[PDB]
């Protein structure tokens, strides 16, 4: 019941395919990456060195990409303001080149003719959304964005605690492997950009990066000051509730010893691992959460498609 | 001036033998480890597969090792306290299997015939010394610990720190290879042993530990919460400042962008990462200092032993 175009077929944009292929409502009708033919564009998607081999059907016809028996137009277009978008009905372009984030230029995908516009990475000026955290706070805007897969994993943990004890401040730190032998780190907007979506939570979180050799799923650290005191178990008991409840798709939750990979391919924003954490006294405790890199995000970005529709 | 034998022909006490075979007034008597032949402490200790081939000249006589001239008697009992400690006039005994960690089994050492015992290992009975923190308060006990690598790591910031600004509490996080494609988090005593160096900081700190695969570096996380405002500039000409003085070997400091490898046989005991860290508001940083799993550790241990004897 709703026609979608993705632009860029690189990680995401190949995974917010397979995903949006499974969706009853949603009909893709294009793809576009101007550096890639149609040839190579089924190549990858059906032996995809990232995502492994698709379990479905595929093929072309130079100008197609056949999945399934479903026909997907394909192009190669540099400029999204000349895309077909309005001749082809598109309501909801995907943008997951990470070059049109901005709205400005994410504005070429309407002047196509799209309805709308869903950016697959963080924007300065289109508004952020996280599913589980401020979906609900979508107004009819024409372009969103569905912020990044770091802070999709720390936000709904963030939203789940401030709303249970509220939250005075918080530092985080995440150890990843997003796109040898060295720990790197570097700055990251990722915590900052919660206050983007918990107005409530503006300037009051931050953090920064280690970059790690590892596979695919990466982990939050999150070290905050609480505003009422706590035990472990009821901040265990808090996220719990919300991953059994309507979130259940989206907060998951675990009190096993685990490893990073397995949660790979995990669908869920952010898994909390309760025998990870450890609080100190009952205003300050620091809490982890996992995230596949791409899985949980990507399923986000296909969720707020269904969500702006 | 100072004999001394070293238990445990592992990792550590190979780099501890390379370390006081150098210093002036230290004289290696022996090493013990019941799991190898003088043959194979030999090969292994020219040929280490762990710290390089050594520089200088190595052989045996199939009961003593031949380094540089310098020959050392080499012993493989089970039972420490079968060792002729007391006939060699063993001043210092370095135990270095981590089997021995504790007072009642440091003891066979003593009961050998050495004066003294060094556990390069952190111990729950064995009183504790951090050089750099207080090994000014030291009072001639006969069984000593140097903590662990990591602890030597955070207890100087620690120090600095709760000096300048004051901790009234933190939480830290060390992402470490410490003896594949995983991060892996774990429990660690750590950071809640700097309480033991440090006192006045009992019950004031503690965290947690993700084991990745990368080099010998590692690097210590710490997100702590001042007694005292502060700005990122005083805390790091605060850190700068010990580290040009006194403990100039002992603790490092950097601005620069780096690669945990950046510092593999680096000998400080931990060096501060100025452009790493990040202050959300005057009382509540993220401070990380990186360090060598053995380097700045195993040069602490023979420091410790020249202290102590
Ligand atoms: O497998 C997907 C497609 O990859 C490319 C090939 O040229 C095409 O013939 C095939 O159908
Ligand atoms: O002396 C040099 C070498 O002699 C021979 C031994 O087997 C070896 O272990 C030793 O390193």
Redesign the pocket.
């Known amino acids: 019941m709703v026609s979608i175009a993705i632009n860029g077929f690189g990680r995401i944009g190949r995974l917010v395919l397979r995903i949006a292929l499974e969706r009853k409502n949603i009909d893709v009708v294009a793809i576009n990456d101007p550096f890639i033919s149609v ?1 190579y564009a ?2 990858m998607f ?1 032996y995809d060195s990232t995502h492994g081999k698709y379990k479905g059907e ?3 016809d130079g100008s197609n990409l056949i999945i399934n028996g479903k026909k997907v137009a394909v192009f190669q277009e540099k400029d999204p303001a000349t895309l077909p978008w309005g001749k082809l009905g598109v309501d909801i372009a995907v943008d997951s080149t990470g070059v049109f984030k901005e709205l400005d230029s994410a504005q070429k995908h309407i002047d196509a003719g799209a309805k709308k516009v869903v950016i697959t990475a963080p924007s300065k000026t289109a508004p952020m959304f996280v599913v589980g955290v401020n979906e609900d706070k979508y107004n009819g805007e024409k372009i969103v964005s569905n912020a990044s897969c770091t802070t999709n994993c720390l936000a709904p943990i963030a939203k789940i605690i401030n709303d249970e004890f509220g939250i005075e401040e918080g530092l985080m730190t995440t150890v990843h492997s997003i796109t040898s032998g060295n720990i790197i780190p570097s700055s990251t907007g990722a915590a900052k950009a919660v206050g983007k979506v918990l107005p409530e939570l503006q300037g009051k979180l931050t953090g920064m990066a280690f970059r790690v050799p590892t596979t695919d799923v990466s982990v939050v650290d999150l070290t905050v000051k609480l505003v009422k005191a706590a035990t472990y178990d009821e901040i265990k008991a808090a996220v719990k509730k919300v991953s059994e409840g309507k979130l259940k798709d989206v907060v998951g939750y675990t009190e096993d010893a685990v490893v990073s990979s397995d949660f790979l391919g995990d669908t869920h924003s952010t898994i909390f691992d309760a025998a990870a954490g450890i609080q100190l006294s009952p205003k300050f405790v620091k809490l982890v959460a996992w995230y596949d890199n791409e899985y949980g995000y990507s399923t986000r970005v296909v969720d707020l498609v269904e969500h702006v529709a």
Chains 1, 2 share one sequence.
């Open positions: 040839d089924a190549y059906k595929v093929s072309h």
